[PDB]
Amino acid sequence: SNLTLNFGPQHPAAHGVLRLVMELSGEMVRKCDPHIGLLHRGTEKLIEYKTYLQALPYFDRLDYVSMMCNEQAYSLAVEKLLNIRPPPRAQWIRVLFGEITRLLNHIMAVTTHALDIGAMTPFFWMFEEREKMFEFYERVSGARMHAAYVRPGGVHQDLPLGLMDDIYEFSKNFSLRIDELEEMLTNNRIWRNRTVDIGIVTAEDALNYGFSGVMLRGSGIQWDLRKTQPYDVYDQVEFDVPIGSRGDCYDRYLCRVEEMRQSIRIISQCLNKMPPGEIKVDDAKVSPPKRAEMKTSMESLIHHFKLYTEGYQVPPGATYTAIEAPKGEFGVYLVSDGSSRPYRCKIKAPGFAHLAGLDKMSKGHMLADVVAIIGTQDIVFGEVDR
Amino acid sequence: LHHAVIPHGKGGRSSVSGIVATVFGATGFLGRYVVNHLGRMGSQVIVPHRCEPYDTMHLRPMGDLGQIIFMDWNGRDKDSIRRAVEHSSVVINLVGREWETQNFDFEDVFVKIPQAIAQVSKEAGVEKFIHISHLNADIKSSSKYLRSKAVGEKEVRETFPEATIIKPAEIFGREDRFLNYFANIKTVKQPVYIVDVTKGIINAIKDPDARGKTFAFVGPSRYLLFDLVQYVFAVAHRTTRDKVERIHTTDKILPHLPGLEDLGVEATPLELKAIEVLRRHRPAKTIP
Amino acid sequence: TYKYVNLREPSMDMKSVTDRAAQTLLWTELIRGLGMTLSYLFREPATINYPFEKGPLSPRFRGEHALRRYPSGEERCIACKLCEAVCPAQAITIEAEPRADGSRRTTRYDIDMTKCIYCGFCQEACPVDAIVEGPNFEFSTETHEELLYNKEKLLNNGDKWEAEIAANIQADYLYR
Amino acid sequence: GEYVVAKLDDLINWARRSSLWPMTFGLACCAVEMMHMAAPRYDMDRFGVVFRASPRQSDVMIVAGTLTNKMAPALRKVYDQMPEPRYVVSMGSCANGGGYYHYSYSVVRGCDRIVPVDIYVPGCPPTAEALLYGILQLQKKIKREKRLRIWYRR
Amino acid sequence: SKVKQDMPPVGGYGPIDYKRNLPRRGLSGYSMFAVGIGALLFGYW
Amino acid sequence: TSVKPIFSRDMNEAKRRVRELYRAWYREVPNTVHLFQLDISVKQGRDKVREMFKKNAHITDPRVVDLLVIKGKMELEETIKVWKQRTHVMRFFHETEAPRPKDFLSKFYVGHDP
Amino acid sequence: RPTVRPRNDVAHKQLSAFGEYVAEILPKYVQQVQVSCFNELEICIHPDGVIPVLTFLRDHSNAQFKSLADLTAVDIPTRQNRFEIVYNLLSLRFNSRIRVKTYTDELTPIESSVPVYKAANWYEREIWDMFGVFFANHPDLRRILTDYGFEGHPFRKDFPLSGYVELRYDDEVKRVVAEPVELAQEFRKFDLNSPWEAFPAYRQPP
Amino acid sequence: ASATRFIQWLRNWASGRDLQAKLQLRYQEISKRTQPPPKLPVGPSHKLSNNYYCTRDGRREAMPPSIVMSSQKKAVSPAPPIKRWELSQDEPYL
Amino acid sequence: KKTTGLVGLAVCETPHERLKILYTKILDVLGHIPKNAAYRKYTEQITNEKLSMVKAEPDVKKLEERLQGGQIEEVILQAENELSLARKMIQWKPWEPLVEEPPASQWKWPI
Amino acid sequence: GVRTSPTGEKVTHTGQVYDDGDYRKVRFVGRQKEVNENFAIDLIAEQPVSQVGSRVISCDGGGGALGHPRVYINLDKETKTGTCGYCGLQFRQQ
Amino acid sequence: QLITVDEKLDITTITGVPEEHIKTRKARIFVPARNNMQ
Amino acid sequence: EDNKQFFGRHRWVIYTTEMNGKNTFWDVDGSMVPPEWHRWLHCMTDDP
Numbered sequence A: 001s002n003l004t005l006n007f008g009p010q011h012p013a014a015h016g017v018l019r020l021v022m023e024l025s026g027e028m029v030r031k032c033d034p035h036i037g038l039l040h041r042g043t044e045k046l047i048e049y050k051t052y053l054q055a056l057p058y059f060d061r062l063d064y065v066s067m068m069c070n071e072q073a074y075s076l077a078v079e080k081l082l083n084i085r086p087p088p089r090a091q092w093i094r095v096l097f098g099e100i101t102r103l104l105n106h107i108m109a110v111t112t113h114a115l116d117i118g119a120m121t122p123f124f125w126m127f128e129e130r131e132k133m134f135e136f137y138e139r140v141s142g143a144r145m146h147a148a149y150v151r152p153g154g155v156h157q158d159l160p161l162g163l164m165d166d167i168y169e170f171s172k173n174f175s176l177r178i179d180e181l182e183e184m185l186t187n188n189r190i191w192r193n194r195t196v197d198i199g200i201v202t203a204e205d206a207l208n209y210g211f212s213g214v215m216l217r218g219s220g221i222q223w224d225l226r227k228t229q230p231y232d233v234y235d236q237v238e239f240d241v242p243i244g245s246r247g248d249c250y251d252r253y254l255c256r257v258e259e260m261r262q263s264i265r266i267i268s269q270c271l272n273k274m275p276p277g278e279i280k281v282d283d284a285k286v287s288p289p290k291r292a293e294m295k296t297s298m299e300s301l302i303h304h305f306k307l308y309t310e311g312y313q314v315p316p317g318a319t320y321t322a323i324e325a326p327k328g329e330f331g332v333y334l335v336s337d338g339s340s341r342p343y344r345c346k347i348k349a350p351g352f353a354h355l356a357g358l359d360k361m362s363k364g365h366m367l368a369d370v371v372a373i374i375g376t377q378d379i380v381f382g383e384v385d386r
Numbered sequence B: 001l002h003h004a005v006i007p008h009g010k011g012g013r014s015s016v017s018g019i020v021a022t023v024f025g026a027t028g029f030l031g032r033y034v035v036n037h038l039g040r041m042g043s044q045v046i047v048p049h050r051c052e053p054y055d056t057m058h059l060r061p062m063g064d065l066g067q068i069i070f071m072d073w074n075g076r077d078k079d080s081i082r083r084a085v086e087h088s089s090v091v092i093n094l095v096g097r098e099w100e101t102q103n104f105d106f107e108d109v110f111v112k113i114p115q116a117i118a119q120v121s122k123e124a125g126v127e128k129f130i131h132i133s134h135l136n137a138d139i140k141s142s143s144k145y146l147r148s149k150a151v152g153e154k155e156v157r158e159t160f161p162e163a164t165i166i167k168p169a170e171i172f173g174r175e176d177r178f179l180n181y182f183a184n185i186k187t188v189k190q191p192v193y194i195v196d197v198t199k200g201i202i203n204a205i206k207d208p209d210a211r212g213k214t215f216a217f218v219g220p221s222r223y224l225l226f227d228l229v230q231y232v233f234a235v236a237h238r239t240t241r242d243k244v245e246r247i248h249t250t251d252k253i254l255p256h257l258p259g260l261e262d263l264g265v266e267a268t269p270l271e272l273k274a275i276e277v278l279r280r281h282r283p284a285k286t287i288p
Numbered sequence C: 001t002y003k004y005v006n007l008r009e010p011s012m013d014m015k016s017v018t019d020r021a022a023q024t025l026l027w028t029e030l031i032r033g034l035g036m037t038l039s040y041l042f043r044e045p046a047t048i049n050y051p052f053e054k055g056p057l058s059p060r061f062r063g064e065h066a067l068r069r070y071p072s073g074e075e076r077c078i079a080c081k082l083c084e085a086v087c088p089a090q091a092i093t094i095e096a097e098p099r100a101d102g103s104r105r106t107t108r109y110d111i112d113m114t115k116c117i118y119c120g121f122c123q124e125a126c127p128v129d130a131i132v133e134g135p136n137f138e139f140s141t142e143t144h145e146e147l148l149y150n151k152e153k154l155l156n157n158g159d160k161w162e163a164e165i166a167a168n169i170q171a172d173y174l175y176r
Numbered sequence D: 001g002e003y004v005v006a007k008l009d010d011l012i013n014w015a016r017r018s019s020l021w022p023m024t025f026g027l028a029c030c031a032v033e034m035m036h037m038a039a040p041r042y043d044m045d046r047f048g049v050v051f052r053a054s055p056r057q058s059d060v061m062i063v064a065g066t067l068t069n070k071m072a073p074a075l076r077k078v079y080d081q082m083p084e085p086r087y088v089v090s091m092g093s094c095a096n097g098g099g100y101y102h103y104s105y106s107v108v109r110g111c112d113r114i115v116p117v118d119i120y121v122p123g124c125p126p127t128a129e130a131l132l133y134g135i136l137q138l139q140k141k142i143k144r145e146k147r148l149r150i151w152y153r154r
Numbered sequence E: 001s002k003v004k005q006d007m008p009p010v011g012g013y014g015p016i017d018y019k020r021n022l023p024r025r026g027l028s029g030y031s032m033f034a035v036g037i038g039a040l041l042f043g044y045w
Numbered sequence F: 001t002s003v004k005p006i007f008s009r010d011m012n013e014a015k016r017r018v019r020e021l022y023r024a025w026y027r028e029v030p031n032t033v034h035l036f037q038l039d040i041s042v043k044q045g046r047d048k049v050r051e052m053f054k055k056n057a058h059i060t061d062p063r064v065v066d067l068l069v070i071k072g073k074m075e076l077e078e079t080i081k082v083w084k085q086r087t088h089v090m091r092f093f094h095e096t097e098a099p100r101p102k103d104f105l106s107k108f109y110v111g112h113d114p
Numbered sequence G: 001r002p003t004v005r006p007r008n009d010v011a012h013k014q015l016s017a018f019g020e021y022v023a024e025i026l027p028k029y030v031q032q033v034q035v036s037c038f039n040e041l042e043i044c045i046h047p048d049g050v051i052p053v054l055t056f057l058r059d060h061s062n063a064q065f066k067s068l069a070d071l072t073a074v075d076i077p078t079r080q081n082r083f084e085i086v087y088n089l090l091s092l093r094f095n096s097r098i099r100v101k102t103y104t105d106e107l108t109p110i111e112s113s114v115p116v117y118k119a120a121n122w123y124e125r126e127i128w129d130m131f132g133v134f135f136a137n138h139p140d141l142r143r144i145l146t147d148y149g150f151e152g153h154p155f156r157k158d159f160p161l162s163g164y165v166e167l168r169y170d171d172e173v174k175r176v177v178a179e180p181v182e183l184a185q186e187f188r189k190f191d192l193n194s195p196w197e198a199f200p201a202y203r204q205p206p
Numbered sequence H: 001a002s003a004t005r006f007i008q009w010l011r012n013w014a015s016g017r018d019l020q021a022k023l024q025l026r027y028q029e030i031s032k033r034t035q036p037p038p039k040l041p042v043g044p045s046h047k048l049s050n051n052y053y054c055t056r057d058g059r060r061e062a063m064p065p066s067i068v069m070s071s072q073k074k075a076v077s078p079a080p081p082i083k084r085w086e087l088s089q090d091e092p093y094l
Numbered sequence I: 001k002k003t004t005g006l007v008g009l010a011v012c013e014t015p016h017e018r019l020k021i022l023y024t025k026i027l028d029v030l031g032h033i034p035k036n037a038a039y040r041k042y043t044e045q046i047t048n049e050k051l052s053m054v055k056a057e058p059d060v061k062k063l064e065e066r067l068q069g070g071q072i073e074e075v076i077l078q079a080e081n082e083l084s085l086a087r088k089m090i091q092w093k094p095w096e097p098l099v100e101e102p103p104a105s106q107w108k109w110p111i
Numbered sequence J: 001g002v003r004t005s006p007t008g009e010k011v012t013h014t015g016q017v018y019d020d021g022d023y024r025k026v027r028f029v030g031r032q033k034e035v036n037e038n039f040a041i042d043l044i045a046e047q048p049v050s051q052v053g054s055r056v057i058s059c060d061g062g063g064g065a066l067g068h069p070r071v072y073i074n075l076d077k078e079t080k081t082g083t084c085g086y087c088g089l090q091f092r093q094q
Numbered sequence K: 001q002l003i004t005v006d007e008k009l010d011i012t013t014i015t016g017v018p019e020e021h022i023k024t025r026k027a028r029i030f031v032p033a034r035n036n037m038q
Numbered sequence L: 001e002d003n004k005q006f007f008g009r010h011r012w013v014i015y016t017t018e019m020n021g022k023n024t025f026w027d028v029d030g031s032m033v034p035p036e037w038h039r040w041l042h043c044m045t046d047d048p
């Protein structure tokens, strides 16, 4: 028999809409054919009509649960082509908010996974924590989600006075919140029945199918771009990479919960090691000058005028730059033709290859398991469809 | 032509058709097709409505931003009529009711209201006036509906001599009270499709010849009423005293009046569209 | 450096085996989960009493747009079109000409608030603090057309909110 | 007469605005802010706006995100299956009028080309509080309805 | 004026817990079964 | 003028695939009208198939023909598997588009477009 | 120098040496090998070499590029073969990335690389959908991102940004319809390029 | 903060934690919503001399790609093999 | 070893024997490739280097460290991959001259 | 300096007003025409001319960095005031 | 193995462009004039 | 204000029953807060 899954659950859900065409024999799933493009918005074409600065907000809206991490990936790619370097304080801020963003993503990933499986309550507890982290976003950028804060050259503005104290107070209590979540799920026999030995993927298959992030580490592969190909100041912080052993949904859930704990561990070092200095590269042909300078110095006014109309030119070249985003390897293949607008911008969304493996991972499972497998991949269709 | 009403574009949603039309009775069966066709080509449509704004919502997507304007109006308040037609170049009157009510009788909706609209439109300088009457209007009909249609048809011509009067047969379509009426339950009928009536009205606005004329909109074929009702029940795989009287009036033949053909519209056969209307309820020989 | 999340050997001694049998038969870890939800029942909820209580915001908040003036009442905008050039959504439309007194001023200044992405690039780009994103966020409307702001609406927003806008700029301008 | 019709309108309007069951089309990032309106700080349930509502049990559709051409027929179908009275809240720039993707070949330039819209909530995304302001604004729109008053004067 | 920007306090912030903490509670398996069986015996008696 | 073929090495091989695709579309139309509850007749549907085929009748490049058949098969698969909806099928008929003027005078009256 | 990105000559030398290595082993297919100033290795190959070259890079013991990071295309209309197919591969064993590029035109198919990387399945569907490049022997080639019945390939440089058609709901036919695109506000094209040369190092000969 | 002592004991016992020490609701420990003005530092290019842009021009130091082979001995790998990761000493097993 | 740690990769009881057989088969297959082909010269060099380590080191932990290819079962998997590639290379014959030159401006960027 | 046209519609500070036969004024029926009443051209004309001693003066609009870019105004001509091109303030050499 | 095609290259039928925007358009091929202001 | 309440509930407004000629006894909304108080009520500042 043939069956089509609903676009989305009957409670608020923010992953997007999916048309899943399935072939069933009794309870068992024999074929899965995801039909995507329901949130395809031609982002990659629109970027070709934007300057490099104008295109930056598009990356907030890809994996719109990991906004600043997507900003970081694009900023690093442009900085590489520009051959410039963001100042050390900006790099620490980018790592600090990169890990705050990882917490935001992992709360959404773990709790909506549970919510779709029927465990509603943890979503409410942990989204109060998300609400407090939205306030950190809003205090640095003026926006709760699409901050547009991390830019090529550094960050847009320095932290307001008193923000780091508040991030410390939040971080001080967060591990307790994780513990409460683990009390509800980790040892629960119903949760384990829904996740243990579900969606097993071998280490060999995970690599060939293009998987990344937790979808690799759940199968025992020892890989994390923050460790192996570090960017910004990730080489200066200490943390452990959680590794699974069974390659199933339960191990991937444990990996995500432990990654949240390591993110707190990294945030702690960032709060203590934050250096002084400027927060964007001191090159006014790339980063706009301070407003006081723009209103006093002739050179500053010209460069402000040109950076906000033409934008900076980027030397011709192509780069593939990737980061360890919360959902996996997030990269951009960015082509510059020498002008102030990118010639081509291909976005590599980790969820694209993960969803392409849904049919492989769902073989020999039941219909209700398909919901669990989609959750364990942590799919957001803004990044899948672009 | 005022510069703002010179046509521009390619005839689409964002285009400018140059038509500024006030459609009284727009929230009904015929009005939703007329407004849709006006909005398709980027006309400005003024929609005076008596009903709750909730009941006008289906008209909102029919025009580009700003092209559909809603107003409150009362049939017996001439100031509300004047505000609606003050800026229009054409006024279309689709007001009517198939039954009488405590507050409004057939004389109110088919005589007093059309006359008031026509008079205020003339006093406001409106250039064109479209009035929907009925093919079987007659001051000797057994139906009070058709009697009032005749009296109002005369008063509109007296008040607005350049008015274009249209006299359709019973109209069939998704929201009609004809095929749906039969599917819910001697005489010869010539039913006409809703889209044909709508197209003819739109063409009468754009056609300078239609001014001062009276049209009869009828379908291609004439059907004995019995054959028609049997056909409906087959396709479907299966009220008031006035409504029965109207339904049993034989459709008048008026060869002297121009028809849909004169306005460039090809009458749609009933058999082509019968399934469309009656599919939700799940060939008659014509009279040559 | 890495760690194992699920690589543990359950003990097979009788005491440990009977601990797991007790958990299976007596639902101990399910009872534990009931304890957690019970404790939350007796916690103060996090809910605030909107609209009488409001969520906290900062001076940097990006809300409804407004066009500002100098203390004398003259408009700050001199129709340079930097905001229109930078706008990532092409939400801004400007026309300008010499004013009757010779000033360089706009005759059109539109923001399509349904194109806008509320990014704040316009206020970054503006050289004279003319276009800002204000603190207001409660301006939902019943029609689409009401969200196509023209210059009069934006100037009225500036005159309406200047008291708050000026204080917020005073609070954040040294970070810019 | 008019007094009895006036109070019946108040009673039915009160019941309907006090029991607004929403169908959320969580299309993109705006759905995240919608989830935060359900979250404890705002708790839309406390206004009578239930968390989980089936499309056939819904009174209001919230369009929370970009509407693509590929998705537009499915959204219309859900709207057509909604029992009346039914209202549509357009949330965010994409749903309001295309937003950042207005000039895209694959995007509907505003969901009001597909369905009638009652409330437009601006922002990209609107904050959870701005969405809640919009829902409260829809409630006051329902409060002003005079369905029985109109019917009595027909 | 001295430079003034958001910085950590002198000496840094206090320690931040991050490791899992699920405390052990309750009796052993033997003790729980004994309690359950003793309850049955009293009930039967 | 030496190129890698797609499927067919010459026009005769390509025309075999065209005829096979026409056969499949021709037989599918009655099912499509029923499955999608279309208000058009089977004759109208088959006439539409003929018109779409006819508009490409002038091609002489076997590679271009291969691509046209590749795309035609994709379109058929969308229709048979009911991945399309009713709106997608009816997009071949442009029912809400007003006829656009063809002769010089009609175009001259309505705008500047040729 | 605080604002300038530091060089890494060690990686530049390693990648150059491995670039020659690959060229020596696959002379039948390799047309060009370059290492960018930010240390990225690109192997430009003849399209016939897609499967041999990718298979070699996946399976050779000195390569082991087991992970296909990304597969995409670029449209350059001025080239006789306007489409450039780009494979971004990753080797976990040697903690390295390589890029493999080939080319095709509108009518010349490319061999599907699904046999080498299962990841390629959807990437090639997307390239077919967005650019119209046909991949031979692909198990299930069809559109993936665009709407059903969509005509054209939107990522081609000559496809208009807003396309040719747009949708709306029509009450008369009671369905969503597609009509030629008209915009209330035309997209405003900006000419941004400065008339002065920016980067002398990339100047082309007259 | 204002729970009765009995209610504090009940929810502490039920949860098995000292909830009162890490309340999820914020009180007066947070920063004041009015702060003193900042005085932000300037970057390393803020100098009056020895600061010619051509000595700090990153964009102009970018070069076109080095062409290693164009169609116009010991084996090598793209880099040395990655070093095996070490088990955490902070907590090797969860 | 209780487990390799990688899901789907079984432990090998006799890794030294398995590698000796696999590396010998690879050298046998390379003999059908022309002597001057770079693939044969390089693959034989690295294969002989690894085969010597397998013979010198009878301790799996110390052999794993010498080879630097992960676990010993990962080395065995890579040897099976190289043998598979070697067989395919014989049919592709990539040591032959370039099949065709690109158009003149094919790889010119910017345009 | 708002003024109403013969039809009663207010004229904006940009001089806009629908003329007599313009249908587009139907949009205001039952609603209103948003017109800002504080005409900047009239408000800047109320500012007194500032009397200064030097030949050249600078204006930044007031408020330091919260004003406009600082420009310098020549006051040699005695037939007219020097007017700031950003804020419209006038100066005269005494 | 390759085939022989002597047809003039034409892709109009496989680009998806409406006929109106192929047959009635006039493309202009030029080198833009220098902006006289610079 | 009540600073013993947790952050968020420590400031609130009791809306007037009549504003600009509108009876707001039952119908209140957030746009009734004037800008000078908007800043304090949303904790953009500490000083009323």
Ligand SMILES: NC(=O)C1=CN([C@@H]2O[C@H](COP(=O)(O)OP(=O)(O)OC[C@H]3O[C@@H](n4cnc5c(N)ncnc54)[C@H](OP(=O)(O)O)[C@@H]3O)[C@@H](O)[C@H]2O)C=CC1
Residues within 6 Å of the ligand: B024, B025, B026, B027, B028, B029, B030, B031, B049, B050, B051, B075, B093, B094, B095, B096, B097, B098, B104, B109, B132, B133, B134, B135, B167, B168, B169, B170, B171, B172, B177, B178
């Ligand atoms: N349908 C047919 O078969 C034929 C119809 N006609 C004529 O076509 C016109 C419309 O047809 P149809 O659309 O089917 O009629 P409907 O009843 O479907 O629509 C009637 C319209 O008139 C308005 N209306 C009715 N009574 C009043 C009133 N007392 N005061 C103000 N407005 C009022 C209604 O507004 P509300 O929604 O507020 O009630 C509605 O918009 C009528 O004039 C009818 O006589 C002529 C020949 C055949």
Ligand code: SF4
Residues within 6 Å of the ligand: C083, C086, C087, C088, C089, C090, C091, C092, C111, C115, C116, C117, C118, C119, C120, C121, C122, C123, C133
């Ligand atoms: S906030 Fe951003 S999108 Fe909105 S008008 Fe300003 S620049 Fe444009």
Ligand code: SF4
Residues within 6 Å of the ligand: C076, C077, C078, C079, C080, C081, C082, C083, C084, C094, C122, C125, C126, C127, C128, C129, C130, C131
């Ligand atoms: S608002 Fe500012 S940036 Fe925009 S045109 Fe006016 S002065 Fe220029």
Ligand code: SF4
Residues within 6 Å of the ligand: A061, A064, D028, D029, D030, D031, D064, D065, D066, D091, D092, D093, D094, D095, D099, D100, D123, D124, D125, D126
């Ligand atoms: S309006 Fe903004 S937040 Fe909402 S879906 Fe569109 S881009 Fe995302």
Ligand SMILES: [Zn+2]
Residues within 6 Å of the ligand: J059, J060, J061, J062, J068, J084, J085, J086, J087, J088, J089
């Ligand atoms: Zn000045």
